[PDB]
Amino acid sequence: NSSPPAVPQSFQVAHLHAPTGSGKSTKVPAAYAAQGYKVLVLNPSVAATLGFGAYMSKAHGVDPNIRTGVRTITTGSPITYSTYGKFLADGGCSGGAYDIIICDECHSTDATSILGIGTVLDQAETAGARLVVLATATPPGSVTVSHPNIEEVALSTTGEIPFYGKAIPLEVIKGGRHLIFCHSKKKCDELAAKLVALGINAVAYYRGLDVSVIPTNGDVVVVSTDALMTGFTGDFDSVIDCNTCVTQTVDFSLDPTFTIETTTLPQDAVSRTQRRGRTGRGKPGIYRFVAPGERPSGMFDSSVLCECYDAGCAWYELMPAETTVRLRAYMNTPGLPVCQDHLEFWEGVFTGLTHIDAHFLSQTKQSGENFPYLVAYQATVCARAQAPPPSWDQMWKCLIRLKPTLHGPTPLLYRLGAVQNEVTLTHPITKYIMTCMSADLEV
Amino acid sequence: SSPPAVPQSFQVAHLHAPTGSGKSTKVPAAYAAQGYKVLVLNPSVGSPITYSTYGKFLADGGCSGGAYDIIICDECHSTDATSILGIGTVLDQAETAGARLVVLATATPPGSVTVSHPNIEEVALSTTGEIPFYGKAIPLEVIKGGRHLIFCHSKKKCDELAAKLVALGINAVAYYRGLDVSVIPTNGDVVVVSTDALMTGFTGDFDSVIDCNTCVTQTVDFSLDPTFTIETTTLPQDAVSRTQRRGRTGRGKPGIYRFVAPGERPSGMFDSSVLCECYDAGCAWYELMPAETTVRLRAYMNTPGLPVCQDHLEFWEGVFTGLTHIDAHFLSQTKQSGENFPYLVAYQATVCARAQAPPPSWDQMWKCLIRLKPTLHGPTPLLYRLGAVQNEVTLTHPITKYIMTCMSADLE
Ligand SMILES: [Ca+2]
């Protein structure tokens, strides 16, 4: 639906699939507000959420409420901006206080977005909402299109700088600001250095690497992971894309049980569009690529469901079964990212993870781990057996007191990283998880 | 409309046109009419127009220097090894063998979904019925009476379903990779609970088709036991799968399509194990040096508008180069067993034979080694996992160290 959905006399779920140009998060809510409706606009980033309030004030004479976990600006207004996470943290839909709920950037396959969107899909009507718009410029199945404000040019094997099978010639990047996307930290570094060898000032940016990129529009080539979030990104004469990315994948390896790991795969449509798009911000730019292909958008990994369950327990006080209610509505609602149906399995494993250690859980949460619940739970079983974590990496920090937890074999329940210690596969909970896999996972 | 007319220079066009074009009838006859001798290639198939197959094209060695002006690679969305290798070979040799136009024809382009079907009364499934079909349920008033086809992803899934049905009064016949005619040919009311092993061309004349919307595919795991593992995976079906599953119903009659899940995937990428198959097939079938395979595969990968895959070209070419001194006799045998990776099977058999050791398991994949009198040597030197390993293994054979190294170097 290219136009902003019309609020119906009775509850309904509409899909607004308009380009990033339409003010889906700004012009749209303002429009509904002007009709007298109370709208809630949800986005994945705090950057975004906080940003929409500013714009609105000036650009739309609307001073909205901006709810973020770190800042909750409240000014009794029909338009409320919040991140899916703060939404989920605030109890969900939790009052008959919105006529319209815009789930913006609804194509996001991060745990907090899927859980946040399924929560709306399951509570809006009952909460007194007549419209829930699933907005996105990249619906599932989308392949990147274009806007000739960007000239796309295939890299070739001819060139002084070796690049993912191809080669970047010096004449394209030396002289000007350019952004080169690499799938990993190493590549970012190894590329920057070699770029410097040839007399260019490359800046390798990635996770935990404080923003060291130069704002001044001088000459520079920034080689980085996607960790360079958008928003400020823009003044680059071009971008050179490796056309790949690292993704979290679950592996039902059957070591004791499953493994959360990564795989580097061809990028999908939103990744390319997002990478490509960091040039051509007013002045026409160029996009140079290693591969002419990608994968369409709208498919996420089972590990993300595992994440939704890990979030429900750790941050949202949701019994695995309440989480399955929310995620099931997401999987029952058409026109959204797709993933293999593993709700019974995940719900099944998390329900058996009873009596987690409260302190360990606080620690793993504050520490910003990917799976605070699965981490603190493995720590919990280890401590109760007086056994050591599977490795002494940062992850298992909360068990720091390796002294009593000396007795070797760790009762491994699953693998969230590299396992260094000798393990044992006979813990009741390990065995419980294997039954859940036999019970809900075929082969 | 029409296909891209023959240009002044050689180019690669995209007849991303469906059945409404006649890519296997009218698109060729058009070019033939203009005086052009066309070669049309499909997974399955004088006058200036030859209709063939990709596999037959590889068997013949590819493009003949001066034979066709037009080459249409039909069903260019096909990601089975032979199709990938065949399209890459055309893309690599086309021009130099005198071709002016290469049209990549596909009824379902990238990012394309379920087709507009004006006859199949398609309906969503509701959770109503005591025939729970994949988390939901089926109403036996839909299956009792008339001929039908339910698609499950597994053999054992087909088995159990046909079973719950028979205990409810329905004539259910399970069908998967095995015996046909299990479905009666002219007796109605039958219900076939099939795996995709029942090919589309078969057509059991069905009233409806209920789809589980899932699929099983071959995938490789870089498991690092010794090296890698050829295995499978279940994933949401895609726009191509739905089309072929739902296109099976009626065929002459209107028909109906029932489905569990609302989603799928508009086509997509193909696994790295298919890359392995191409190197395996090149070695085993086409007398192709790994580097020749790499050239043809790179041609495919450099062309826009084709399914994508991970760039493992160097890795695979690297592992097959180290697959030295294979037993010509085991390979002749694995090739005729209709094995999946005849080269890799025949190679693992050679290192066992050489070592006088038994295969990983005694599954019929290893029938070339039935002289297990001396090949009883307890530990089998595991080069990789192609199936279930039931025998004690050793991981010190040089080829194992070689593949591991290739992994380290080529895979991050
Ligand atoms: Ca696996």
Ligand SMILES: [Ca+2]
């Ligand atoms: Ca593992």
